[PDB]
Amino acid sequence: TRQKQELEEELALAQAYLEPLERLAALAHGLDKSPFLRVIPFLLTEKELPLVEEALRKALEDRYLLAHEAYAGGVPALVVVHRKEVDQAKAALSRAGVAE
Amino acid sequence: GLIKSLAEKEKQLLERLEAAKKEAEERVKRAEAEAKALLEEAEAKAKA
């Protein structure tokens, strides 16, 4: 029964979050294990996408990279920012109400 | 904006660091060797 519970919880999460993580991984392929670049994953709905972009753009100038790729419904979005620009990047998501 | 910009720029940032560390060690290396050979000339000369 213990195996069975672990097997069932794993399925339940994996069934939910495989498609976003696939999308997100793909967007910054081979750049998630680099120290030079920082990646932050987050989910946005069609509604939220414009607000988030504005907020990041003012906060982070034009030396930030906002990319998104669909999955059937909203977009999992990835913002890629320089290392040591992490706090600022985060602060920008937090003001819109979007989190990591 | 393509991911290719930062991707293929990162893999150059790593080469620039590597040459830095190389020619740091390959310089000090020379000096340590040159310090030995100098003090051998100072023994060779001094006893003769």
Q: What is the DSSP string of B1-48?
A: --THHHHHHHHHHHHHHHHHHHHHHHHHHHHHHHHHHHHHHHHHHHH-
| Spatial distance between the Cα atoms of A65 and A89, rounded to a whole number of angstroms | 11
| Spatial distance between the Cα atoms of A1 and A17, rounded to a whole number of angstroms | 25
Q: Determine contact, residues A30/B7, Cβ cutoff 8 Å.
A: yes
Smallest CA–CA separation between A12 and chain B, in Å? 32
Measure CA A36 to chain center: 18
Q: Inter-chain contact B6–A65, Cβ cutoff 8 Å?
A: yes
Of B3, B13, B14, the CB nearest to A27: B3
Sign for the CA dihedral angle at A8, A12, A15, A20 comes to negative
Method used to solve the structure: cryo-EM
| Spatial distance between the Cα atoms of A74 and A4, rounded to a whole number of angstroms | 32
Cα–Cα distance list, A90 to A25, A27, A74, B13 (Å): 19, 19, 21, 25
Nearest to A83 by CA among A26, A41, A34, A28: A34
Amino acid at A31: L
Q: Inter-chain contact B13–A67, Cβ cutoff 8 Å?
A: no
Residue found under tokens 């294990």: A33
Q: What is the 3-state secondary structure (H, E, C) of A36-86?
A: CEEEEEEEECCCCHHHHHHHHHHHHCCCCEEEECCCCCCEEEEEEEECCCH
List CB contacts (< 8 A) between B6 and chain A.
31, 37, 65, 80
b/e map of A19-56 (b: 16 or more CB within 10 Å)? ebeebbeebbeebeebeebbbebbbbeeebbeebbebb
**A77 DSSP β-pair partners:** A42, A68
| Spatial distance between the Cα atoms of A83 and A4, rounded to a whole number of angstroms | 42
Tokens of A38: 């920082």
Tokens of A10: 């794993």
Q: What is the resolution of this structure in A?
A: 8.7
Q: Cα torsion for A92, A96, A56, B7, to the nearest 10°?
A: 90
